Design an enzyme around this catalytic site. Sequence first.
Site, PDB file in Angstrom:
ATOM      1  N   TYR A  20       0.823  -1.229   0.000  1.00 13.49           N
ATOM      2  CA  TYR A  20       0.000   0.000   0.000  1.00 13.49           C
ATOM      3  C   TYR A  20       0.854   1.277   0.000  1.00 13.49           C
ATOM      4  O   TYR A  20       0.247   2.337  -0.179  1.00 13.49           O
ATOM      5  CB  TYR A  20      -0.885   0.012   1.253  1.00 13.49           C
ATOM      6  CG  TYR A  20      -1.867  -1.129   1.273  1.00 13.49           C
ATOM      7  CD1 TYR A  20      -2.958  -1.100   0.439  1.00 13.49           C
ATOM      8  CD2 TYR A  20      -1.725  -2.205   2.112  1.00 13.49           C
ATOM      9  CE1 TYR A  20      -3.873  -2.141   0.383  1.00 13.49           C
ATOM     10  CE2 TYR A  20      -2.622  -3.264   2.066  1.00 13.49           C
ATOM     11  CZ  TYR A  20      -3.716  -3.220   1.228  1.00 13.49           C
ATOM     12  OH  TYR A  20      -4.620  -4.259   1.171  1.00 13.49           O
ATOM     13  N   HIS A  25      -4.311   6.217  -1.272  1.00 13.74           N
ATOM     14  CA  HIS A  25      -4.859   6.261   0.082  1.00 13.74           C
ATOM     15  C   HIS A  25      -3.784   6.494   1.140  1.00 13.74           C
ATOM     16  O   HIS A  25      -4.130   6.704   2.316  1.00 13.74           O
ATOM     17  CB  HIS A  25      -5.673   4.993   0.350  1.00 13.74           C
ATOM     18  CG  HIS A  25      -6.973   5.118   1.101  1.00 13.74           C
ATOM     19  ND1 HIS A  25      -7.771   6.230   1.064  1.00 13.74           N
ATOM     20  CD2 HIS A  25      -7.617   4.203   1.823  1.00 13.74           C
ATOM     21  CE1 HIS A  25      -8.867   5.984   1.780  1.00 13.74           C
ATOM     22  NE2 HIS A  25      -8.774   4.741   2.234  1.00 13.74           N
ATOM     23  N   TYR A  71      -4.540  -0.303   9.731  1.00 24.89           N
ATOM     24  CA  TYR A  71      -5.291  -0.257   8.493  1.00 24.89           C
ATOM     25  C   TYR A  71      -6.207   0.976   8.562  1.00 24.89           C
ATOM     26  O   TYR A  71      -6.648   1.405   9.648  1.00 24.89           O
ATOM     27  CB  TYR A  71      -6.030  -1.544   8.136  1.00 24.89           C
ATOM     28  CG  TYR A  71      -5.054  -2.650   7.765  1.00 24.89           C
ATOM     29  CD1 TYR A  71      -4.557  -3.528   8.690  1.00 24.89           C
ATOM     30  CD2 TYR A  71      -4.510  -2.724   6.498  1.00 24.89           C
ATOM     31  CE1 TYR A  71      -3.603  -4.497   8.370  1.00 24.89           C
ATOM     32  CE2 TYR A  71      -3.575  -3.697   6.129  1.00 24.89           C
ATOM     33  CZ  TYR A  71      -3.107  -4.569   7.084  1.00 24.89           C
ATOM     34  OH  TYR A  71      -2.122  -5.490   6.736  1.00 24.89           O
ATOM     35  N   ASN A  73      -9.326   1.872   7.935  1.00 26.65           N
ATOM     36  CA  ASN A  73     -10.667   1.979   8.504  1.00 26.65           C
ATOM     37  C   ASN A  73     -10.674   1.775  10.015  1.00 26.65           C
ATOM     38  O   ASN A  73     -11.768   1.899  10.614  1.00 26.65           O
ATOM     39  CB  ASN A  73     -11.648   1.042   7.842  1.00 26.65           C
ATOM     40  CG  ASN A  73     -11.430  -0.361   8.206  1.00 26.65           C
ATOM     41  OD1 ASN A  73     -10.429  -0.723   8.804  1.00 26.65           O
ATOM     42  ND2 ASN A  73     -12.260  -1.197   7.580  1.00 26.65           N
ATOM     43  N   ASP A  98      -5.674  11.739   1.903  1.00 27.64           N
ATOM     44  CA  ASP A  98      -6.119  11.817   0.517  1.00 27.64           C
ATOM     45  C   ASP A  98      -7.560  12.329   0.454  1.00 27.64           C
ATOM     46  O   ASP A  98      -8.413  11.931   1.266  1.00 27.64           O
ATOM     47  CB  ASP A  98      -6.076  10.452  -0.126  1.00 27.64           C
ATOM     48  CG  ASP A  98      -6.762   9.340   0.621  1.00 27.64           C
ATOM     49  OD1 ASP A  98      -6.461   9.135   1.841  1.00 27.64           O
ATOM     50  OD2 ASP A  98      -7.567   8.580  -0.022  1.00 27.64           O
ATOM     51  N   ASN A 119     -12.762   6.654   4.789  1.00 32.26           N
ATOM     52  CA  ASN A 119     -12.944   5.633   5.774  1.00 32.26           C
ATOM     53  C   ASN A 119     -12.009   5.731   6.990  1.00 32.26           C
ATOM     54  O   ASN A 119     -12.279   5.176   8.015  1.00 32.26           O
ATOM     55  CB  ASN A 119     -12.946   4.203   5.223  1.00 32.26           C
ATOM     56  CG  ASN A 119     -11.681   3.649   4.546  1.00 32.26           C
ATOM     57  OD1 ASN A 119     -11.496   2.380   4.341  1.00 32.26           O
ATOM     58  ND2 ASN A 119     -10.776   4.499   4.141  1.00 32.26           N
TER      59      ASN A 119
END
Length: 196
Positions: A20, A25, A71, A73, A98, A119
């Site tokens: 990632y 994100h 993570y 969320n 973002d 999120n």
Amino acid sequence: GSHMSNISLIVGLGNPGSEYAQTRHNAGFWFVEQLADKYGITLKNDPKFHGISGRGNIEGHDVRLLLPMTYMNRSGQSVVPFSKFYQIAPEAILIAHDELDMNPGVIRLKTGGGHGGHNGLRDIVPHIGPNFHRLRIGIGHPGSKERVSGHVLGKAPSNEQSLMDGAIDHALSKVKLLVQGQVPQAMNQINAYKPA
């Protein structure tokens, strides 16, 4: 704890892992990692707060940096206990993230408001309320709600990456104003950025 709206906690949102790190994100991680390098703030493992964090001097002010490793969320599972433990009020927090609702190469400083569908922010606002500052790093929108995952978890094409990188670099130059409490001036000078 924090003092007034001098910014003393700067959070970057993102997902952990090399798969990632280059995705849209993670724009908040890009900003905070670059800021830490600029000021020589060590980002070290912080298992207690489920993150990577640091503390150091920015322009004569004691500032903490945080990258949740929850993570996206679950970002509040890091930001909320960290801010509470260090007695940092929302008004002294900047969260870089973002922003789907702005173009690559657009960047804005906003105070308050909702999550806008993000999120990570969605996991934070219920707990500390909305009155923290946000560095909204434009990434563009893929069209539809079904596509948002592929878009935010995608690696931007080089032109878009360049546009974001320039905007992030501009914002790094305005952090001095933020840690000094000059939120209005920082807002005006961040929001005025153009790529070209």
